[PDB]
Amino acid sequence: GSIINETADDIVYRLTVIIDDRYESLKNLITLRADRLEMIINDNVSTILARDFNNLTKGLCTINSWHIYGKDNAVRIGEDSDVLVTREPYVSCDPDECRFYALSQGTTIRGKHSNGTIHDRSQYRALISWPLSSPPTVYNSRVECIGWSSTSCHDGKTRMSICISGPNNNASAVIWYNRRPVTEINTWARNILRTQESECVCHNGVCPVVFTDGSATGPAETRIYYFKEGKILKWEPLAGTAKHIEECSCYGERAEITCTCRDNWQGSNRPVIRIDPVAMTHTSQYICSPVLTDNPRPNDPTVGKCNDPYPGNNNNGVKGFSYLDGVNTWLGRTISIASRSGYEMLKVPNALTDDKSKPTQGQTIVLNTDWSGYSGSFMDYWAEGECYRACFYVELIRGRPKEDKVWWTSNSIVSMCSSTEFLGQWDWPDGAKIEYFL
Amino acid sequence: GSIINETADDIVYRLTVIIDDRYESLKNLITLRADRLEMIINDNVSTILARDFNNLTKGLCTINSWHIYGKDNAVRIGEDSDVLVTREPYVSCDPDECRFYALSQGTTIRGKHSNGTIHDRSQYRALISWPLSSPPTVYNSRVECIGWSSTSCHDGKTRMSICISGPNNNASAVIWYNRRPVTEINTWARNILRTQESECVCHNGVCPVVFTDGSATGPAETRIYYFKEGKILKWEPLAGTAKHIEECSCYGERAEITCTCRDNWQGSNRPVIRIDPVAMTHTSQYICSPVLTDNPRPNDPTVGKCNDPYPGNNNNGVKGFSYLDGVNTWLGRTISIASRSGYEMLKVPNALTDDKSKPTQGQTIVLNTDWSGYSGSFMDYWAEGECYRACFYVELIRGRPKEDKVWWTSNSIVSMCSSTEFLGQWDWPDGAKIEYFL
Amino acid sequence: GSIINETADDIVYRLTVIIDDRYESLKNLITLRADRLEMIINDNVSTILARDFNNLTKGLCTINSWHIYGKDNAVRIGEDSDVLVTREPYVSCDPDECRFYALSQGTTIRGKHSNGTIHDRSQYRALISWPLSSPPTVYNSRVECIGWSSTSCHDGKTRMSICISGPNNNASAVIWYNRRPVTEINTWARNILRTQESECVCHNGVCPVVFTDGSATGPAETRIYYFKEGKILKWEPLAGTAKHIEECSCYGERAEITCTCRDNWQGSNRPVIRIDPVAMTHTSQYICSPVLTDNPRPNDPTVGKCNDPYPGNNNNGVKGFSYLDGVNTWLGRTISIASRSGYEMLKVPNALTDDKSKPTQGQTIVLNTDWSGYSGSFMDYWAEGECYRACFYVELIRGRPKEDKVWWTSNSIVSMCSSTEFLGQWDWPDGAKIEYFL
Amino acid sequence: INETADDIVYRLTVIIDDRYESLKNLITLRADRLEMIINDNVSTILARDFNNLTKGLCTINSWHIYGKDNAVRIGEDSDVLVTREPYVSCDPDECRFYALSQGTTIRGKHSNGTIHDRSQYRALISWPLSSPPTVYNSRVECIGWSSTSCHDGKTRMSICISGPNNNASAVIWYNRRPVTEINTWARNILRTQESECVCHNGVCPVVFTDGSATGPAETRIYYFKEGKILKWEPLAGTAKHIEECSCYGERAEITCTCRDNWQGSNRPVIRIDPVAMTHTSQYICSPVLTDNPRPNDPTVGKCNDPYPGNNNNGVKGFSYLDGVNTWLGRTISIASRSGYEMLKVPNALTDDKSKPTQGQTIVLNTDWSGYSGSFMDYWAEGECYRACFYVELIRGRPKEDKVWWTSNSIVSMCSSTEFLGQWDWPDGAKIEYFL
Numbered sequence A, B, C: 001g002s003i004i005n006e007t008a009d010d011i012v013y014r015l016t017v018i019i020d021d022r023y024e025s026l027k028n029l030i031t032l033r034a035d036r037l038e039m040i041i042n043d044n045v046s047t048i049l050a051r052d053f054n055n056l057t058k059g060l061c062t063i064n065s066w067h068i069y070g071k072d073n074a075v076r077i078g079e080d081s082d083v084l085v086t087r088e089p090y091v092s093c094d095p096d097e098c099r100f101y102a103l104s105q106g107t108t109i110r111g112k113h114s115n116g117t118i119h120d121r122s123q124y125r126a127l128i129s130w131p132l133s134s135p136p137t138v139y140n141s142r143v144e145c146i147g148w149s150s151t152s153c154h155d156g157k158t159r160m161s162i163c164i165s166g167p168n169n170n171a172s173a174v175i176w177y178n179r180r181p182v183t184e185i186n187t188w189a190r191n192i193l194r195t196q197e198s199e200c201v202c203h204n205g206v207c208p209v210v211f212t213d214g215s216a217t218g219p220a221e222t223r224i225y226y227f228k229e230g231k232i233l234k235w236e237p238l239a240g241t242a243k244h245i246e247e248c249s250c251y252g253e254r255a256e257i258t259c260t261c262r263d264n265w266q267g268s269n270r271p272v273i274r275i276d277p278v279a280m281t282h283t284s285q286y287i288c289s290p291v292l293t294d295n296p297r298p299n300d301p302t303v304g305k306c307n308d309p310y311p312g313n314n315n316n317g318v319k320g321f322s323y324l325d326g327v328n329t330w331l332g333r334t335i336s337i338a339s340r341s342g343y344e345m346l347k348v349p350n351a352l353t354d355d356k357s358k359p360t361q362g363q364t365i366v367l368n369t370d371w372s373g374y375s376g377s378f379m380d381y382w383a384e385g386e387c388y389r390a391c392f393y394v395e396l397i398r399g400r401p402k403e404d405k406v407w408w409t410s411n412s413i414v415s416m417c418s419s420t421e422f423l424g425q426w427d428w429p430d431g432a433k434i435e436y437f438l
Numbered sequence D: 001i002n003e004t005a006d007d008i009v010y011r012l013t014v015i016i017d018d019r020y021e022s023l024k025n026l027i028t029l030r031a032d033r034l035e036m037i038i039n040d041n042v043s044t045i046l047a048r049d050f051n052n053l054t055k056g057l058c059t060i061n062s063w064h065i066y067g068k069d070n071a072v073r074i075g076e077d078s079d080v081l082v083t084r085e086p087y088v089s090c091d092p093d094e095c096r097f098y099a100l101s102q103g104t105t106i107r108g109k110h111s112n113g114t115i116h117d118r119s120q121y122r123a124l125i126s127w128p129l130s131s132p133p134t135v136y137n138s139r140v141e142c143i144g145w146s147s148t149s150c151h152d153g154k155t156r157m158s159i160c161i162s163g164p165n166n167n168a169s170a171v172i173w174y175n176r177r178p179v180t181e182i183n184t185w186a187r188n189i190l191r192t193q194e195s196e197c198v199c200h201n202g203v204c205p206v207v208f209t210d211g212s213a214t215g216p217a218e219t220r221i222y223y224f225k226e227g228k229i230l231k232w233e234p235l236a237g238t239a240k241h242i243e244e245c246s247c248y249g250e251r252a253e254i255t256c257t258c259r260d261n262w263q264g265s266n267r268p269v270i271r272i273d274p275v276a277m278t279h280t281s282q283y284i285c286s287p288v289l290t291d292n293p294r295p296n297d298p299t300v301g302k303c304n305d306p307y308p309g310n311n312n313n314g315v316k317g318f319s320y321l322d323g324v325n326t327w328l329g330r331t332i333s334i335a336s337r338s339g340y341e342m343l344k345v346p347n348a349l350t351d352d353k354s355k356p357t358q359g360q361t362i363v364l365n366t367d368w369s370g371y372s373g374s375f376m377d378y379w380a381e382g383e384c385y386r387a388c389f390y391v392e393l394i395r396g397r398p399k400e401d402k403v404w405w406t407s408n409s410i411v412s413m414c415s416s417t418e419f420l421g422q423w424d425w426p427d428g429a430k431i432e433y434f435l
């Protein structure tokens, strides 16, 4: 109703939206910068801290040949050195180190007490680990726990070891997490509770393990306890078509835990355990491949068996392993179908599934003239790269019953990892002259 | 008045309004993020530092059996390895590590100096500790202190070690804390200053310790010292009904320390110093039970003495322990009454307070055809869970006096912890074969 | 518009401008301090670890005298103690620590399996590091990797080890990065694949290694592989006017790596490999100087040869080294022109480039009446200062073939670094008396 | 309006300035705050400073046991190294025994003839308190037959003189890396402390001699820091001859107790201000003579010249020289290296007629002693530095000649504020057992 009063409503409104935008610009920008810093700190502060469980994300690498990881020469050195009488060993890793493991027998090899160390079980045996390619010396070995029946594995945070000790009929296991005990299972069938004698594998903190309690030469009760933080999460009686289970050797990839055991009853074809470390579920069967990997065994047939035991040889065998990855599939055996000597790695594609598969390639590890034993799986789960480098060890057993002109029984170790190249093979024996030992 | 000069006034007023208004909304905001950024920065920096004093917040776990914990097989290994001569062993945990302790006699077992290692006090002895279930060796054994009587514990922040050294009549204690010497305490009765010979116990930095200076059998001058940071907060003469005290085996539940000690003056019924480390006070009595846990000892009566001494066998004893916790009460003793051999643990509800209390459970540890020795209390005040798993070591004695064919005395160690399960029992001998040393 | 329009209009304007100048002045500030922080934050965060690839950014320190650094006296301790039988040693530094390295023979000097350690290659040899100046004991010596020829270097981030193993006709290199295998490489001329047997040298992540495969008595196939993070970036075949290459000893001045090798065919002067590690290329020749530094060799002439072997001595030589840095050029060689005997250093201004060059200074390390052997070079790449300190080692072989008294071959180690002052000189014999070994 | 408009633009400007100003200031004064804060809190994540001797001695009313190896005893059946000239140095986290290695075990045939001092096969080693010097525990710092080693609170300085009599050098190490190297200045067994040195705000004085064991010689005080020669002095004061100093710090002063090898049988004494980097010398005045061999104690001793008796001989020893809190150490015998003892001698350094007012037997006169030297754990908790020392127990030769070697073991004590009862601390080797 007059300019003198509408220009005043004009000078105000025209200066508001200025203020109102500038403020909005300052307002929102102070927000974004302060939201920037709050996230910076948080991350940089998270990063000052650490660790998580490991997940079986990657798959195996292509196996074209095997290369040498480690060797302890144990027996050689401790003809003149305080080196522990062990047997039944295996390799395992932690985020930032891999170490040997074995069941110490309580004496040094020269020690007199090393007499009669061929007995598997007593109050003097103990899961110890020690630095890769060092011996089980008196001064360098770390006792992980007491007894004569072990497994161990890291879950990505810390490690879990399980020792079984006791008389034949009254045995327990203790599950150490983070180096303290947590759980003790008691024998259920009271006839030599036993387990893996090689590393276990964990997906997101779940580490299953395979026990057997019962006849070594008949039906037994095997169980697939799933472990997290040493506590028991669940157990399943064994199911599937494996008819006996002993001394499994295990690996994992693409969130599946495949274990490759010994049939000590009628088997000469190895049983196999498939495990889902999430559902906490398992199936089982035997390697199909006609190519018999136990020990002793009949001679390779043309065609084998998937869901029954390969007959011929009963009440015996050796701990062995495989990597069953389709065609990238390699199996491991003694060379002999009689005794514990020689070792090879056979590419036998589709071994798990194909009851007529045969070898396309190989590599000798030990000649069929030098002595050997047990052998199992592991991988550097914390290695770099995009694939899991398949690796195995083999136990080279000197002493009774084979070279019985010494009174002891101990061993040494050889371990190897996959190569994607095709490498010249050597052979790898214990290296010790038994006669030096008299 | 005008409506120009007065309109000016107006346009400035109205604009002034929102300018302040936008000033303060922007004001208030920096303030807010500033304060919000300052809150994260020190919440974050806090997490990066600090570590606190252990408080005995927990009661004890149900004891239903005992699982093997540690073993060293020392005498077995030391038959052919640089293992130290020792005796008076025990265990004590840190926040990050359980270890074995002993009095070293500054010689290896196969060492000529092993000769006359039966003696108890010498210029050459010392408190060593080592990785659990290793043997005490020259190369891995850490000396905490020089002396011939010892205790150690961890305040939850650092560790205290007490050693005593000297001629019977001139002994003095040195108190180490953080690995450095702190307090010294001279003999008061001029006759062998002594202490627990097994690990002490802490609550809020207060670590009590039972001390003794006088006759092996008289009256003696036992005192309770209340330490913290290796410094003396207080000490008090011994009160209560205890005729005599030595070598207490302590342990901590819900803000209270119970030490079962050794009675030489008459003891086959042990005394029990009970301490409160907040009030800083104690109270001694006896175990009422007719299950006499001292050696040598009379056979067992049907009813025993509740707070006096029943002679029986007289003037000699043995170090030793129990766990006193109503129905969940456990005490151990050598099988034998003659001598330091065999060891059992026995479940005796309310044994301290009931003079007719009888055994309701057992677990042989060492049979009565192998040797044993001193025996003791410790716990991992650091594990996780709702309660403390009771643990004890048993000392396993070889050489003099009971095996005189040899010129020396050493020992191994064994230790069990409790279990919530009824685990089957094994025995646990040292292993050693004397004839191998001859 | 009108008269009042153009007045209000000029109140909006003058007040917009002002507000804007203030908005910009405020925006600009809030921005800056936001930026100030993050930057400060990131930096001050980053300081809470870090680790960059090493860069050869310094020349050599002026060498006026050599001074002592390490010695293990290994053999002397070994007389009575579990030391390992070894040879082919070296020294190499991590950013925080420098270790002696060598190849175990899988046995102790006092062990019976020292019988026959004259042999260069078996299934029982391992690369090893251990504490600088202490001895290669079973207990302190950590296997880097498994092989019978090797090398090792650290990029300032982590460390690369390379072990070659297998039969003569089928050997295989494993490359280790940060303590796990990265890559293998099969033999190419199938004649004892072999490499440096002293440390390698990184520049900004590229660590070149020189390998040989083929004749040792005639003309061979030699390659310079270039590793980063244990992965192969490239491999150049040998080039320029060197004719045979063995046992190269390298160092790094300003972004060059100069490696002095050994002509084991017709060579009695030493080949040289100047590598450009950025362009990942090389070039090669012999040292021009008449001061021949092979072994065995001819007496020295007035004039040597820049570009062919010096003839006169055939199918043999020694590992050794030089530092060629202009007038700051020093050489090492045995004093015996016939045998692995004694060791001296001679300053020879421009040894490499002027075939008339003689000594203008010297120093003795091992008198001629003391055995020596393989020499090699290293520098602690991570010392504070303006230049690198040239260091070297002299393996000192004992036993066969030169002392058949014993059945065995081993070594001890001495090692000097350079000094800008002219210091007195001492002799650094092995130390051992073989008599004792008899 | 053509002036009234000005006034409106003008007035709201001032108000916006008043507002902009306020904002700019609070922002500034709030960002700073956070720049400080973080930077401060960030330094709390990092670490160590140079040690200053800011404290005084504790009151010695007796000495308590600290550590003991049992080296000869254990190393009867154990791969223990032959040593001698031991000592003890603390780092801010551990106290380690140090000695001179001889490059063989004690049952190695190689011990034959290890009596000798200087040989290519010697290094300064070190190992963990009360443990013995073993093959697999003994880490090495440098190489040579003469040494001193001390931490400035940031890190360690080991030192080793190697070489022939007439051409020796000292290589000084800083943080485990050779930094400097010095050469003989009178080419005659260049040598130093044989015990631990002592730092103050990272200057670390070391005492050296090069010259005659048997006459006027060239003794020098080098002033170190991070392994560098800031300065060096020649001897001053009234000490006619210095060897084998045993040094200790308190209240920003380093005090050393050395050995006159030439004519003295009272111990000479270097006092060093580490800051002004300047010193003097004299002798302990006390007629409680302290060296060995030594003449029988007189009534009065000498302050500023050697006490006559026994030329051309000595043993390395130490003392705490702190007014009425002075305590002298010495062998019991005047003749050999046997028994060892502590005596309280109010004002030994200044009072030329001071005699005991108390004392403690460390080692019986029927047992071997040897070298002894001052150390102190400058990184203890408290308001005072606990006076500590070690004694070398020499077994073997020359006094025990039915073996062929010369090893030692260690004993070490620290001061107490209590009057603690006493014991004796022998090596414990039974010589017979070797034969």
Ligand SMILES: *[C@@H]1O[C@H](CO)[C@@H](O[C@@H]2O[C@H](CO)[C@@H](O[C@@H]3O[C@H](CO[C@H]4O[C@H](CO[C@H]5O[C@H](CO)[C@@H](O)[C@H](O)[C@@H]5O)[C@@H](O)[C@H](O[C@H]5O[C@H](CO)[C@@H](O)[C@H](O)[C@@H]5O)[C@@H]4O)[C@@H](O)[C@H](O[C@H]4O[C@H](CO)[C@@H](O)[C@H](O)[C@@H]4O[C@H]4O[C@H](CO)[C@@H](O)[C@H](O)[C@@H]4O[C@H]4O[C@H](CO)[C@@H](O)[C@H](O)[C@@H]4O)[C@@H]3O)[C@H](O)[C@H]2NC(C)=O)[C@H](O)[C@H]1NC(C)=O
Pocket: A169, A170, B290, B291, B298, B299, B300, B301, B334, B335, B336, B337, B344, B346, B358, B359, B360, B361, B362, B363, B422, B423, B424, B425
């Ligand atoms: C696999 O391993 C498992 C797990 O361990 C094995 O099972 C274990 O077997 C052992 C060995 O027997 C058991 O330890 C024994 O414990 C018993 C206590 O249990 C009994 O008593 C309880 C109730 O007592 C009351 O009974 C009634 C009313 O209830 C009444 O009449 C009376 O008032 C009394 O108070 C019962 O709860 C218990 O029954 C349960 O447990 C049974 C298993 O034992 C089971 O079978 C039942 O079905 C039921 O579930 C049972 O009846 C102790 O008797 C015994 O301890 C004594 O004996 C040992 C060995 O001889 C000796 O070393 C001990 O010192 C002790 O005896 C001394 O003290 C007494 C008091 O002073 C005295 O009376 C004795 O004469 C003796 O004195 C002598 O010795 C000492 C020193 O040596 C000397 O001072 C004296 O002067 C004199 O010389 C055992 O400790 C475990 O409990 C048991 N574990 C479990 C969970 O079952 C299993 O067998 C294994 N399988 C294989 C294949 O091996």
Ligand SMILES: *[C@@H]1O[C@H](CO)[C@@H](O[C@@H]2O[C@H](CO)[C@@H](O[C@@H]3O[C@H](CO[C@H]4O[C@H](CO[C@H]5O[C@H](CO)[C@@H](O)[C@H](O)[C@@H]5O)[C@@H](O)[C@H](O[C@H]5O[C@H](CO)[C@@H](O)[C@H](O)[C@@H]5O)[C@@H]4O)[C@@H](O)[C@H](O[C@H]4O[C@H](CO)[C@@H](O)[C@H](O)[C@@H]4O[C@H]4O[C@H](CO)[C@@H](O)[C@H](O)[C@@H]4O[C@H]4O[C@H](CO)[C@@H](O)[C@H](O)[C@@H]4O)[C@@H]3O)[C@H](O)[C@H]2NC(C)=O)[C@H](O)[C@H]1NC(C)=O
Pocket: C290, C291, C298, C299, C300, C301, C334, C335, C336, C337, C344, C345, C346, C358, C359, C360, C361, C362, C363, C422, C423, C424, C425, D166, D167
């Ligand atoms: C305390 O310790 C200190 C520090 O170590 C001791 O001092 C050190 O002691 C040693 C011994 O002297 C010295 O090393 C020797 O140095 C000589 C070279 O130095 C001399 O020559 C320099 C160059 O002069 C010549 O060339 C130019 C012309 O181009 C010109 O200068 C002149 O015309 C002349 O022609 C001189 O600058 C230098 O003089 C300076 O130094 C003197 C001190 O060194 C000083 O007195 C002077 O005043 C001046 O300041 C000096 O004269 C090295 O060449 C010599 O090495 C040769 O000799 C031995 C054999 O015993 C052997 O180790 C070497 O292999 C070498 O001999 C062979 O090489 C030649 C080339 O092929 C050949 O010609 C020889 O015939 C011989 O070849 C034969 O023998 C070898 C051996 O195996 C065999 O393989 C062949 O096949 C063939 O059979 C020494 O390395 C240090 O330099 C010196 N250090 C310092 C800093 O002083 C001190 O003594 C100690 N104190 C005591 C008393 O203990």
Ligand SMILES: *[C@@H]1O[C@H](CO)[C@@H](O[C@@H]2O[C@H](CO)[C@@H](O)[C@H](O)[C@H]2NC(C)=O)[C@H](O)[C@H]1NC(C)=O
Pocket: C052, C053, C054, C055, C204
């Ligand atoms: C040494 O020099 C090279 C470049 O000549 C550096 O390589 C760089 O690595 C850092 C990693 O963050 C980055 O700046 C670049 O990715 C690389 N090259 C550049 C500068 O473009 C190497 O890191 C240098 N190292 C040191 C410690 O000086």
Ligand SMILES: *[C@@H]1O[C@H](CO)[C@@H](O)[C@H](O)[C@H]1NC(C)=O
Pocket: A039, A040, A041, A043, A044, A047, C042, C043, C045, C046
């Ligand atoms: C801090 O975090 C930011 C964003 O998450 C990132 O750019 C940077 O890597 C971190 N700075 C470090 C690790 O210093």
Ligand SMILES: *[C@@H]1O[C@H](CO)[C@@H](O)[C@H](O)[C@H]1NC(C)=O
Pocket: A042, A045, A046, A049, B039, B040, B041, B043, B044, B047
């Ligand atoms: C840092 O602080 C914020 C707020 O105080 C908190 O929510 C966050 O969890 C902290 N970061 C870590 C990694 O603990």
Ligand SMILES: *[C@@H]1O[C@H](CO)[C@@H](O)[C@H](O)[C@H]1NC(C)=O
Pocket: C039, C040, C043, C044, C047, D039, D040, D042, D043
């Ligand atoms: C943080 O980085 C800033 C960037 O200028 C610098 O002043 C300082 O060195 C660092 N402060 C701390 C205490 O780390």
Ligand SMILES: *[C@@H]1O[C@H](CO)[C@@H](O)[C@H](O)[C@H]1NC(C)=O
Pocket: B042, D036, D037, D038, D040, D041
């Ligand atoms: C860093 O945070 C601490 C801990 O609350 C505080 O006391 C201190 O004042 C902060 N820094 C500064 C110098 O303000």
